[PDB]
Structures are given as structure tokens and as C-alpha cells.
């Protein structure tokens, strides 16, 4: 198969290091994702890769990845309006009444910050 599961890990700890050289910190404090509740990844198993793979490179491992918990969000396409998921019979758009609605937050991951330690 593919290690599409490491893609995300690999990139974040390459970025830590490449803004550490750029800041000229030379180290880490804390980095900072989001995880929308309905994208079903496991907090544990992607902190645990991140941690595993921070032994590439000496600015990364002196760090800590805090998870927060990211909720869920319902855009509609071709409107000016979104809401949050509650109702599912009457659950069209409160502009524009239809079921187009789709998710623009909470099936999918980011970053969200990181900090450094000057000492
Ligand atoms: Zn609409």
C-alpha cells in the first residue's frame, strides 16, 4: 500500500523544523491542530506517530502536540448562510429551502498554531 497515514506526521515535523532555522529559534515549545469530532481520527494515534517520527530532527524533540477538539459546520453552495447540524426532516438551508448543505468544518484536520522556546 502507502504510508498516507505518515504523510501528515512527516510534513508537520519538517515544517517545525524549517520555521525553527527561518525564526532562528533552533527549538520547539508546543504545536497546536484542530480535529473535527465527526472526521473519526484518533487524537492518540496521530500524537503518537508525531512523536515517533519528532527523533528526525534536534529543534523537533523538545516539543508537545496539543489536540483540540473541533466541532462541525454545514456551508451552502450557491447561498449566504451557515448553520450547525440539529435537524434532519425540516434540515434544508434557512434562506434557501433545500438539503445542499455541506460540511465546511468538522470532517477535516489542520494546524492551528505552533510556539517556541527563546531559553
Ligand atoms: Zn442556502
Redesign the pocket.
Given at each position: 500500500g502507502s504510508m498516507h497515514e505518515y504523510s501528515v506526521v512527516s510534513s508537520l515535523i519538517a515544517l517545525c523544523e524549517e520555521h525553527a532555522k527561518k525564526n532562528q529559534a533552533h527549538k520547539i515549545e508546543r504545536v497546536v491542530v484542530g480535529i473535527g469530532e465527526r472526521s473519526a481520527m484518533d487524537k492518540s494515534l496521530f500524537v503518537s506517530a508525531f512523536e515517533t517520527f519528532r527523533e528526525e530532527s534536534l529543534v523537533c524533540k523538545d516539543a508537545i502536540l496539543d489536540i483540540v477538539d473541533e466541532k462541525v459546520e454545514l456551508e451552502?453552495?450557491?447561498?449566504?448562510?451557515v448553520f450547525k447540524p440539529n435537524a434532519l426532516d425540516y434540515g434544508?438551508?434557512?434562506?434557501?429551502?433545500?438539503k445542499?448543505?455541506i460540511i465546511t468544518q468538522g470532517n477535516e484536520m489542520r494546524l492551528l498554531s505552533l510556539e517556541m522556546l527563546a531559553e
Open positions: 451552502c453552495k450557491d447561498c449566504s448562510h434544508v438551508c434557512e434562506k434557501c429551502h433545500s445542499n448543505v
